[PDB]
Design a protein around this ligand. Structure first.
Ligand SMILES: [Cl-]
Ligand SMILES: [Cl-]
Ligand SMILES: [Kr]
Ligand SMILES: [Kr]
Ligand SMILES: [Kr]
Length: 162
């Protein structure tokens, strides 16, 4: 199991523009197109992303390309975030994956806000931090995913993903 496999399980794969749980236009493997209501806006954003006239549909290949990019940007964002980088570096590899997952899903920003947990996470207080992260809109909104991610973070194993 690795980060790609993990997020691929958590975000799925859709070839046609769809709305996420939040109702935002998205495509591929969790590739948010836009926050705007405009499906037109969304095709435009899509076209620009792919470099062609998609007409709201991409191939698998295209989807995996956005995904590679998105994973990559997620990692690089972490590493340029001053709050984040140090937690990251302190982590073992499974746990690092958990952090990247959250960052991909919520942004450096949304993640920036788990300060209380993350501190505990920097401290190796697996249980404490896990319980605190649970007190989050994040968890209440996508409890099953949230659960898998928090378990991975806490245990440092992929059990949740088997
Ligand atoms: Cl893009
Ligand atoms: Cl979920
Ligand atoms: Kr955390
Ligand atoms: Kr955690
Ligand atoms: Kr966490």
């Amino acid at each position: 199991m690795n980060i790609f496999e993990m997020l691929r399980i958590d975000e799925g794969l859709r070839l046609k523009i769809y709305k996420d749980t939040e109702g935002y236009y998205t495509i591929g493997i969790g590739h948010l197109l836009t926050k705007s209501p405009s499906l037109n806006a969304a095709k435009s954003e899509l076209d620009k992303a792919i470099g062609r006239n998609t007409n709201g549909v991409i191939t698998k290949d295209e989807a995996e390309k956005l995904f590679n990019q998105d994973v990559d940007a997620a990692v690089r964002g972490i590493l340029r975030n001053a709050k984040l980088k140090p937690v990251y570096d302190s982590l073992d590899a499974v746990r690092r994956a958990a952090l990247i997952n959250m960052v991909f899903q919520m942004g450096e920003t949304g993640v920036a806000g788990f300060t209380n947990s993350l501190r505990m996470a920097q401290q190796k207080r697996w249980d404490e931090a896990a319980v605190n992260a649970a007190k989050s809109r994040w968890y209440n909104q996508t409890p099953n995913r949230a659960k898998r991610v928090i378990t991975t973070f806490r245990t440092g194993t992929w059990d949740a993903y088997k």
